[PDB]
């Protein structure tokens, strides 16, 4: 958007849970954003599963994902999560966050084309070192909350450097709540619990369409205890509720 202002009153929801994190919320019509922590809003972290958004688009663009209705066949091998042990649509693989499906997509896209698309998308530090199938999971790729909102705004407007149809296909795959005058697109992320001095990161990013308004959001937090994960949704929902958006 245009402006960003720091709203320190938004710390109340973080301090109540002893969480270190940031929430960025932008209202389209007023071209204005608010955040609890300006400094952290610009700090870059591992995207983890939020990378499914650009990866899905790049997969379609390059033709690795053949079309909108491609089925990703479970081959029979045990997977890290139980919910991934089945055939999945593109929307399904995004929604249940089936990481191995996307690791294979990334391998097929390749280094040259992945690099070019992350440049076109202005996606974070654009550092894809750490292996083609994990740079966004444990490698060197980093993105800020502000950069996520910018990327999501471009996607909403079909202004990414990709076909309008591929942007649309990925947008329907991101729908997480549908009501007559309320629509939510969103995606979670979780890198793990980390180590001594290096906590992991949790994400919730997306946008809310309410009546004729649109609000873009990005949340992240430091995490070293997996039982704290639901906070990645509860904190932003509480803040958006207080704003009259209602999460």
Could you list the active site residues?
49
- CB-based contact 209:27 (threshold 8 Å): no
How far is 56 from 144, CA to CA, in rounded Å? Answer: 20
Residue (of 138, 130, 131, 132) closest to 113 by Cα position? 132
Q: Collapse the DSSP code of 231 into the 3-class scheme (helix H, G, I; strand E, B; otherwise coil) and give the result.
A: helix
Please choose which of Cl ion, its own copies, none residue 211 contacts, taking the beta carbon within 5 to 8 angstroms, the exact cut-off set by kind: its own copies
Say whether 232 counts as a known binding-site residue.
yes
Output 157 or 246, the one with its CB closest to its own copies. Answer: 157
Q: Is 153 in the site for its own copies (CB under 8 A)?
A: no
Q: Is 95 in the site for its own copies (CB under 8 A)?
A: yes
- Shortest distance in whole angstroms from residue 19 CB to Cl ion: 13
Interface segment toward Cl ion; rule CB under 5 A; list 2-10, 127-135, 152-160, 164-172:
127-135
Q: Which residues, 6 or more positions from 157, have their beta carbon under 8 angstroms from its beta carbon?
A: none
Residue from 79, 113, 116, 210 touching Cl ion (CB under 5 A): that is 79
How far is 152 from 167, CA to CA, in rounded Å? Answer: 11
Please choose which of its own copies, Cl ion, none residue 212 contacts, taking the beta carbon within 5 to 8 angstroms, the exact cut-off set by kind: its own copies
Q: How does 17-32 read in b/e, with b if 16+ C-beta sit within 10 Å?
A: eebebbbbbbbbeeee
Say whether 29 counts as a known binding-site residue.
no
Binding residue ranges for a beta-lactam? 97, 188, 190, 232
Site residues (vs its own copies, CB under 8 A): 68-69, 71, 86-89, 91-92, 95-96, 157-158, 164-165, 168-169, 171-172, 175-181, 183, 209, 211-212
């Amino acid at each position: 958007m245009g402006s960003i202002t720091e709203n320190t009153s938004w710390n109340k929801e973080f301090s109540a849970e002893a969480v270190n994190g940031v929430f960025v919320l932008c209202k389209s019509s007023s071209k204005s954003c608010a955040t609890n922590d300006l400094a952290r809003a610009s700090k870059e972290y591992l995207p983890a599963s939020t990378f499914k958004i650009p990866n899905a688009i790049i997969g379609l663009e390059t033709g690795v994902i053949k079309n909108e209705h491609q089925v990703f066949k479970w081959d029979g091998k045990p997977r890290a999560m139980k919910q991934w042990e089945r055939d999945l649509t593109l929307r399904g693989a995004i929604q249940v966050s089936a990481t191995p499906v996307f690791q294979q997509i990334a391998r097929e896209v390749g280094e040259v084309r992945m690099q070019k698309y992350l440049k076109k998308f202005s996606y974070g530090n654009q550092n894809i070192s750490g292996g083609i199938d994990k740079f966004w999971l444990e490698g060197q790729l980093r993105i800020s909350a502000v950069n996520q909102v910018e990327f999501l705004e471009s996607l909403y407007l079909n202004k990414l450097s990709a076909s309008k149809e591929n942007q649309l296909i990925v947008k329907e795959a991101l729908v997480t709540e549908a009501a007559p005058e309320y629509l939510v697109h969103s995606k979670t992320g979780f890198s793990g619990v980390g180590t001594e001095s290096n906590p992991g990161v949790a994400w919730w990013v997306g946008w809310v369409e309410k009546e004729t308004e649109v609000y873009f959001f990005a949340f992240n937090m430091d995490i070293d205890n997996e039982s704290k994960l639901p906070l990645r949704k509860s904190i932003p929902t509480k803040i958006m509720e207080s704003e009259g958006i209602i999460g």
